[PDB]
């Protein structure tokens, strides 16, 4: 609840006819913001209507989350222990700028020892990343692969997928 930064303000002057409902549509655009929101913050959108000298203002507020591109992980539901397993990871660049300084990390207890970070190419807007990773699961059970993507537009974008690693056939 701590106030981070003031991003956008907008003043309208309207005339409402008596006993008439009016709907005003306002576009909330990122490029209108006076500055980029700090990381891990949320958007407080407030409306305030004041008329003449009624000494009372209508007010409403809404908390808006900032939505980052979906990190899609494709991996078989079941995997054999001590056999190589391929997981493809895709991200669509839905921003207004290229994605630069791109680092992707993969980890998960029971599949990968500590973490392995890789660099993939810069992604131009409306293009897609499609990275494939090969690793051998070594522990039997219900495991989880965690993928983290870093760039100059966003950081610590994390998605996960669960894989059941089964014992080899006797």
């Amino acid at each position: 609840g701590v106030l981070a930064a003031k991003l956008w303000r907008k003043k309208l002057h309207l005339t409402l006819s008596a006993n008439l409902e009016k709907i005003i549509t306002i576009g909330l655009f990122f490029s209108n913001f006076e500055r980029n929101p700090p990381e891990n913050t949320f958007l407080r959108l407030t409306a305030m209507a004041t008329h003449s000298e009624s000494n009372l203002s209508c007010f409403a507020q809404e908390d808006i989350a900032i939505c980052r591109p979906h990190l899609a992980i494709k991996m078989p539901e079941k995997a054999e222990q001590y056999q190589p397993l391929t997981a493809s990871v895709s991200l669509q660049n839905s921003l207004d700028a290229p994605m630069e300084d791109c680092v992707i990390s993969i980890l998960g207890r029971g599949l990968i020892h500590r973490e392995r970070s890789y660099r993939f190419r810069s992604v131009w807007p409306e293009n897609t990343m499609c990275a494939k990773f090969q690793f051998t699961p070594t522990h039997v059970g219900l495991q989880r692969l965690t993928v983290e993507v870093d760039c100059n537009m966003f950081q610590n974008l994390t998605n996960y997928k669960s894989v059941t690693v089964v014992a080899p056939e006797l």
Partner: peptide
Amino acid sequence: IQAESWDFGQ
């Protein structure tokens, strides 16, 4: 609601 994968590691 955004779910963040967490390693409790107990």
